[PDB]
Design a binder for this molecule. Structure first.
Ligand SMILES: *C(=O)N1C[C@H](NOS(=O)(=O)O)CC[C@H]1C#N
Length: 475
């Protein structure tokens, strides 16, 4: 007989409990021994809150089986009372069941265990080996003999998640969705200096202690979408790295449309003729980014997008995490060149978009993603040259200071809105601009598109998050 071990505590990064192994009592029975005390069954079935006929039928229909479960996960008290009845053939196992003290606030990130206390979703699965420990062994007849192997308890795990920032993102996402009539969305917050995921919240959500498939989707890691205008900063990074474009260089986007063979690119804001590179992001001109893309070639844009991880495996090993797709056409005709440049030529997740913005914010160095508390930060990879990244940072700062609704009072912030397709309203950005600390992606699944919807969410979550992290105001 196996001796189940104590499963490791999961906490947030500051030690708040997120998943707790609490001792329970499980009752199993040997049917044939139970068959010799049938007069005891009704009171046993009563004590278990079980129907007498259902109970009696399960014993008899599993007659020659010598092992069946009567009930699992009783309180130590409830289990004590049953065992006190001294019913022949009724035996107890001291087990552990998981309880989730933060419930729906962090459901998808934490995940949960199965009936056997084995990780089945989220962190519980991803880190199951760390958390599980090793069962002990117990030899029996009927008579109990020896504990021939001890259970070794699982190990504690502190997530990267900051429950304070997680609750703020949860509250603000839920309010943004209700205000917009939206039914689904996600919000990711990442530490750009450490790679840590500080908050990862989805809607709808569920209480893991108490089901609908929409509620179980860890959307930040599995909802894949074309990121649209939110990847124009990486097209611009390619343009600045090509050697052919200064930030003050000009593109004529008049009249806000561009015909490529048969398709017509149409800008959302068509009151522009000459725009500099910052102006192309401020106006979010698909025409401007296309014309720049034609000049530098799609290879250089693909290459930046690949390097910052869009459409690439995040490496987290999180279960069910999706990768999206960044097609490598090798040579791109005009239409595919433009389409990649303004973000409809690829598919990404919110985690990926946030990681990509984190590398941009961290002066072009990508720090590896982590879902667990990072005490020793691994060396990052320089994926965009520091000069280009710092230049794109400044451009994105001007985008916010002018999408005025994204301004973060007390701080210089940077970011870019977009409309995703699969429509979703998006904002990706980071703050403070002078020494970036956190990056954020907001995804709102729309039933009044784009920047007008997602930017106030960014503003409010960033305002709260920077203050929760005691970031000194830089404005
Ligand atoms: C980006 O995703 N774009 C370009 C344009 N402006 O985007 S925004 O939502 O105003 O910031 C319109 C939507 C989408 C396209 N095409």
């Amino acid at each position: 007989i196996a001796i189940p071990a104590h499963r490791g505590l999961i906490t947030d990064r500051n030690g708040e409990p997120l998943a707790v192994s609490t001792p329970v009592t499980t009752l199993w029975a040997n049917p044939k021994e139970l068959m010799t005390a049938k007069e005891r069954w009704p009171q046993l079935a009563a004590a278990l809150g079980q129907d007498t006929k259902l109970f009696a039928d399960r014993i008899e229909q599993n007659a020659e089986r010598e092992f069946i479960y009567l009930v699992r996960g009783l309180t130590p008290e409830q289990g004590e009372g049953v065992i006190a009845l001294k019913v022949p053939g009724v035996y107890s196992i001291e087990e552990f069941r998981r309880f989730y003290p933060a419930g729906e606030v962090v459901a998808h990130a934490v995940g949960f265990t199965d009936v056997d206390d084995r990780g089945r979703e989220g962190i519980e699965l991803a880190f199951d080996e760390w958390l599980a420990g090793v069962p002990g062994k117990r030899q029996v007849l009927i008579k109990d003999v020896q504990v021939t192997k001890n259970a070794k308890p699982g190990k504690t795990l502190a997530l990267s998640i900051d429950l304070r920032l997680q609750y703020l993102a949860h509250r603000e996402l839920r309010n943004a969705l209700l205000e917009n009539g939206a039914k689904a969305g996600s919000l990711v917050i990442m530490d750009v200096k450490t790679g840590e995921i500080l908050a990862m919240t989805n809607q709808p959500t569920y209480n893991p202690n108490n089901l609908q498939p929409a509620a179980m989707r860890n959307r930040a890691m599995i909802d894949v979408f074309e990121p649209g205008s939110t990847v124009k900063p990486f097209s611009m990074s390619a343009a600045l790295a090509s050697g052919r474009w200064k930030p003050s260089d000009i593109v004529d986007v008049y009249p806000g449309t561009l015909q490529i063979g048969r398709y017509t690119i149409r800008d959302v804001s068509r009151n522009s003729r000459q725009l500099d590179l910052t102006g192309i992001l401020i106006k979010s001109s698909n025409v401007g980014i296309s014309k720049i893309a034609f000049d530098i070639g799609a290879e250089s844009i693909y290459s930046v997008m690949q390097q910052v991880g869009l459409g690439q495996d995040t490496g987290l090993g999180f279960p069910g995490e999706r990768v999206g797709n960044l097609p490598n056409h090798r040579k791109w005709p005009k239409a595919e060149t433009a389409t990649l440049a303004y973000g409809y030529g690829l598919s990404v997740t919110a985690i990926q978009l946030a990681h990509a913005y984190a590398a941009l914010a961290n002066d072009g160095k990508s720090v590896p993603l982590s879902m667990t508390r990072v005490d020793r930060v691994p060396d990052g990879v320089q994926v965009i040259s520091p000069e280009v990244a710092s230049t794109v940072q400044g451009m994105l700062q001007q985008v916010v200071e002018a999408v005025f609704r994204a301004q973060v009072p007390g701080y210089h912030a940077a970011g870019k809105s977009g409309t995703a397709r699969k429509y979703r309203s998006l904002f990706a950005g980071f703050a403070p601009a002078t020494d970036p600390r956190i990056a954020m992606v907001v995804v709102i699944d729309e039933p009044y598109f784009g920047g007008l919807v997602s930017a106030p969410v960014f503003s409010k979550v960033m305002a709260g998050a920077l203050r929760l992290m005691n970031v000194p105001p830089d404005n």
